[PDB]
């Protein structure tokens, strides 16, 4: 009845895709399966995954899928009777959560070497344990939060001032400059954003992203793969300790 919230009808140019997009996903996976010899299942547990585009550009000659997990599972087939190819159903069993497919015409050892040598620094992300203590210096705060030398740094922005306050540093606006305490220092002590060995909240993660300080590492973890010629799936170390479907 009445006493209900009214959601805004957005003046936008893109709308929700839904079933016909799920259908393109089905068609693309089913047309991709026969074209390649090996299918890898990889996992990206707690990473921002904005480096997947560079991974794609590097493996331009490989077809990588990262969609909704249940849709990918059912496109691959969940039962031995609805499989497109033999055993893609038990590869669906490795396909459990924040995972992706990788169809290749290449050698499993070369794929594993690439994704074992590939590693890039990324922002903390919520839930990760802090590997360090990051505290801002007392005084005028800069755009890096006292990580690069201050003499080679630019002050943080007055439009990030109110956002920085809502994230929780007692910082003030003196003469157009954001400073913690007083401009000449003294005043107050520093603000320790994160402590060693402590689960980081989204507040702290947003603080770290605003200060452009990276604490986490992006690494794709290959859970397993499947060769079509033998019709056989091989487990690479990861799935013995990662929960399965």
């Amino acid at each position: 009845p009445k006493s209900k919230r009214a959601r805004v009808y957005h003046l936008i140019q893109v709308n929700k895709k839904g079933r016909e997009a799920k259908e393109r996903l089905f068609s693309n996976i089913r047309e991709t399966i026969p074209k390649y010899q090996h299918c890898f299942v990889f996992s990206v547990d707690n990473m921002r995954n904005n480096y997947l585009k560079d991974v794609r550009h590097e493996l331009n000659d490989c077809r990588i899928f990262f969609g909704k997990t249940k849709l990918m599972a059912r496109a691959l087939g969940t039962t031995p009777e609805e499989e497109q190819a033999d055993g893609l159903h038990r590869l669906t069993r490795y396909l459990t959560g924040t995972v992706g497919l990788l169809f290749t015409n290449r050698d499993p050892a070369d794929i594993e070497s690439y994704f074992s040598n590939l590693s890039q620094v990324d922002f903390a992300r919520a839930g990760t344990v802090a590997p360090r203590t990051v505290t801002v210096p007392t005084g005028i705060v800069y755009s890096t939060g006292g990580e690069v030398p201050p003499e080679h740094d630019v002050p943080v922005s007055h439009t990030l001032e109110p956002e920085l306050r809502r994230l929780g540093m007692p910082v003030r606006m003196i003469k157009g400059k954001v400073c913690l305490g007083d401009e000449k220092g003294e005043a107050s002590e520093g603000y320790t954003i994160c402590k060693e060995g402590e689960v980081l909240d989204s507040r702290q993660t947003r603080l770290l992203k605003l200060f452009s300080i990276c604490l986490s590492e992006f690494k794709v973890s290959l859970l397993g793969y499947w060769n079509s010629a033998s019709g056989e799936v091989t487990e690479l170390e990861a799935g013995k300790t990662r929960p399965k479907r």
Binding site: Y9, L11, I12, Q13, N15
Partner: peptide
């Protein structure tokens, strides 16, 4: 509020149409 809701409904309908899609003054002036 009647005028405002009529305006909002017209704006919503016009936006839906345009998102789906991919003289008397002259005589009087003379």
């Amino acid at each position: 509020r009647h005028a405002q809701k009529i305006q909002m409904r017209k704006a919503i309908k016009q936006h839906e149409e345009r998102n789906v899609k991919g003289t008397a003054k002259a005589l009087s002036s003379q």
